[PDB]
Each structure stands twice: as structure tokens, then as C-alpha cells.
Amino acid sequence: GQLFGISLPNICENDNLPKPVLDMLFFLNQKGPLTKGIFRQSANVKSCRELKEKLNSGVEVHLDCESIFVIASVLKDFLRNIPGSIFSSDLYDHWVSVMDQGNDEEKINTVQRLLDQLPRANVVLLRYLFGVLHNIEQHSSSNQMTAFNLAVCVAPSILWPPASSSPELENEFTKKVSLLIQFLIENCLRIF
Amino acid sequence: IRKKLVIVGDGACGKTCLLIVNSKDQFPEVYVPTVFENYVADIEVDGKQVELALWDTAGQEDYDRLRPLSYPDTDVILMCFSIDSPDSLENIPEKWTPEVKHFCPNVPIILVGNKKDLRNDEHTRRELAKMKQEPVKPEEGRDMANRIGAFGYMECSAKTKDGVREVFEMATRAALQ
Ligand SMILES: Nc1nc2c(ncn2[C@@H]2O[C@H](COP(=O)(O)OP(=O)(O)O)[C@@H](O)[C@H]2O)c(=O)[nH]1
Ligand SMILES: [Mg+2]
């Protein structure tokens, strides 16, 4: 029962998310807002490898005993292995232009129309996830992870350009992508 | 004489603070992660004026696709971990050394232990002891440097400035070799 590297519709019966992905988002919603540097501080790579192997085997996992940084890293790895990315690399040129739209309502409208073109399973996951990050950002005075800091730390796991493009292309827009994700974290309640 | 230094290592392990204290001579108070930035340090070593380009990088695995844009024509690597994080040291052979050896064949590596001031910080020790860990010991850093074939091992604290000038002097000597 493999979990990583597969489109979301193909791991989600009637667009119900996999339990271990839901569990990870739950513990991060619970523990994340209390954890300094969550998503930024690097986890133990061997621990991440071990957890990912377990999840990809469908074997039994106790997520309350894992380091929260390990959970954060493995979640991002899951996202980074969705073919085409959860925001769709096909829409990359549109996503990078969102922040050029006029005011906040016009930005929101542009984003809503792009979310409309994503598979349902993607949007359900994004709802959960931007909610978790919004919750975290709400405690930034404690945990230091403002919307901008979180956006820098997660953006490359959420969107990248089509596979045919060079890393220079990704590098050209990576700041704009982080500023878009910062906007979505801050406004996620008006968006989803 | 122009040389290129790239700094790598885990997210939040102190890379940017190290670069800024060395150049601007002032510890930054912001908590902000880096994507890429470039600085220049003029350093005179062994009678030679060097223009040392300092390439700063993101330690997050998320940036693994972009990081190799920094590697071409590198003269010296600073590979960092934090003394208050034994996991950041374990990640040296598990993640950083394989990447650096891949993209920077035969480029000298200085292994740098950051945040030396926290080794005996009471809060740090109790937080690590809770998780069955302790701050990295000097012998452990040295052992790792030997294991990965580093040019040298250095400990520093950007916060106190201890060891900082020596890191970059060593790096510059390595770059000229
Ligand atoms: N106590 C102490 N804290 C440090 C030191 N250097 C950096 N930090 C802190 O470590 C955190 C991350 O540092 P930064 O240089 O931005 O990490 P980077 O992601 O590796 O560039 C910040 O909260 C810094 O204040 C140090 O030498 N001592
Ligand atoms: Mg930095």
C-alpha cells in the first residue's frame, strides 16, 4: 500500500484523504502552534526516512510519539511527491501572476478560479493545510513562524514549474511564489 | 583574487548569522529564513587580498532542487551544524556530505559547529535531556570532520563572535590551496 508519489485522486476513494495524511495535519494543528521554528528547523533525516518507509508500507504508526519536526518534514515530502504538485505545474504561470492583480478581492477571485481547476482531493487537502498554517501563524509571537516565514519554508513543496523547465526558471519566481503563499495563509478563510 | 564560498547545512542552524557577523560585524535579531543571497567579504590572508563571494543557501529539504544553482565553480564549502542540535550533526553524513560530494567534487569542506555558546546553556541542555540527547561535544565534531574528509573543523558563536574570524580565515586558506 504505497502512499507517496501518486496523484491524490488515485489514493483517495471518493476524495476521502488517507488517514496518515489526516493524522499528520491533526498533530501539526495541535502541536505546531506551540513549536518554535516549526517547518523551518530541519528534522533528523534518518527519522524521516524511517517514518516514510513505514507509511509507504501501510504499516502501523504512532504519530503522537514522533518528533513534530519529523511530522512537518514528512508532510512536506508527501506534498513534494505529488506528481505535478498540489497547485498543478500546468497553472504555474497563472499562480506567479496572482499578486500582480489589483486589490485583495481581485487577488482572491483569481485564486478561487484557479482552485476551481484543481482536482477535488487537492482542494480538500489544501483546505486542511492552509487552515493549519493559518493557526500556526496566529501564534507567531511565540513560535516565530509568521505567514512569510511559513511561506518560505513550504512554498517549494506546494508549487513548481513544469518538469521540462530549468531550475533557473523556478529560481526566478521563487520569491513571488512565497509572497503568494504568504497571502493565502493570511487570507485562507476568505479563499476556501 | 576572487574566490567563491558556499555555506550549507540544516535550516535554522546559524548560517546567515555567521555570514552577517563576519561581514557587517553585528548579530541580526530577525528570525527570517533565507532562500538565496550573496555577499562579499574582503579578506587579506598570507599577503594576498581576496574578494570572497559568500553564497548563502536554504537548509530546508524543500530547496533541494534549487540549491545546486549555487554549486558551480565553488572554491570552498562551509558545511554547518548547530552544537545545540545533535540531529543537525547526524544530518551531516546523511544528507549534506552526499550532496556536497556530488556537486562539489574535490572542493575543500570546512565543518563548522555553530552556536557554541549554547553548549552549556541550561535551557538547551534540559530540552535535549528530555529527548535523551545532549549538545554536540568537541570530539564528536572532530570525529565527524575526519569521517567526511573535511579540510578542518571549527566551532564558533555568531552571538559572542567567538571563532568567527578564524572560520573565514581557514576557509580562505582552503580556497587558495
Ligand atoms: N544562541 C545563539 N543563537 C544563534 C547563533 N547563530 C544563530 N542563532 C539563532 O539561530 C536562529 C537561526 O539563525 P540563522 O542564521 O537565520 O539560521 P540559518 O537558517 O542557518 O541561516 C536565529 O534565531 C538566530 O538568532 C549563535 O551563535 N548563538
Ligand atoms: Mg539563512
Max distance between CA atoms of chain B, in angstroms, equals 50
Measured distance CA(B84)–CA(A154) in Å, rounded: 24
Q: Is the CB of residue B88 less than 8 Å from the CB of residue B10?
A: yes
Measured distance CA(B144)–CA(B133) in Å, rounded: 17
Distance to chain B for A66, nearest Cα, Å = 11
Q: Grid coordinates standing for A180?
A: 503568494
Measured distance CA(B70)–CA(A7) in Å, rounded: 31
Domain count, chain B: 1
CB spacing of B87 vs A167 below 8 angstroms: no
- Annotated resolution, angstroms: 1.6
> Which phi and psi (to 5°) does residue A123 adopt?
-75, -40
Cell 562539489: give the residue. B104
Compute the residue count for chain B: 177
Residue B14 Cβ inside 6 Å of ligand 1? The answer reads yes
Give the contacts of A31 (CB within 8 A, at least 6 positions apart): A68
> Which phi and psi (to 5°) does residue B128 adopt?
-75, -35
CA torsion angle for A150, B84, A62, A53 (degrees, to 10)? 80
Q: Grid coordinates standing for A120?
A: 477535488
Expt. technique = X-ray
Q: Which domain holds residue B67?
A: 1-177
How many Cα neighbours within 13 Å face the side chain of A85? 19
Q: Give the class (CATH, top level) of A1-192.
A: mainly alpha
Long-range contacts at A159-165 (CB < 8 A, ≥ 24 apart): A159/A85, A159/A86, A159/A87, A159/A88, A159/A89, A159/A92, A159/A95, A160/A85, A160/A89, A160/A92, A160/B65, A161/A89, A161/A92, A162/A89, A162/A90, A162/A92, A163/A89
The last residues before gaps in chain B (C-N over 2.5 Å) are none
Measured distance CA(A190)–CA(A109) in Å, rounded: 10
CB spacing of A41 vs B10 below 8 angstroms: yes
Q: Grid coordinates standing for A100?
A: 500582480
CATH number for B60: 3.40.50.300
Measured distance CA(B26)–CA(B101) in Å, rounded: 32
CB spacing of B60 vs A153 below 8 angstroms: yes
CB spacing of A153 vs B31 below 8 angstroms: no
DSSP 8-class letter at A72: H
Atom of ligand 1 nearest to the CA of B32: 16
- Packing angle between helix A167-191 and helix A120-137, nearest 10 degrees? 80
Instruction: Give the residue from B105, B62, B125, B160 showing the smallest Cα distance to A81.
Output: B62
The answer to whether the annotation marks B106 as part of a ligand binding site is: no
Measured distance CA(A95)–CA(A118) in Å, rounded: 12
Measured distance CA(B133)–CA(A121) in Å, rounded: 40
What is the interface size between A and B, counted as CB pairs within 8 Å? Answer: 73
Which stretches does DSSP call E strand in chain B? 2-9, 36-45, 48-57, 76-82, 109-114, 152-155
Q: How far is CA A72 from CA A129, B37, B78, B126, in A?
A: 11, 25, 26, 23
Q: How far is CA A113 from CA A40, A95, A107, B93, in A?
A: 30, 11, 10, 45
Nearest CA in chain B to A76: B62
Ligand nearest to the CA of B57: 2
Determine the residue among B8, B62, B127, B128 to mutate to test chain A binding: the one whose Cβ has the most chain A Cβ atoms within 10 Å: B62
Instruction: Give the residue from A113, A112, A114, A110 showing the smallest Cα distance to A99.
Output: A110
Residue type, A112: Q
Is residue B56 exposed (0-12), middle (13-18) or buried (19+ Cβ within 10 Å)?
buried
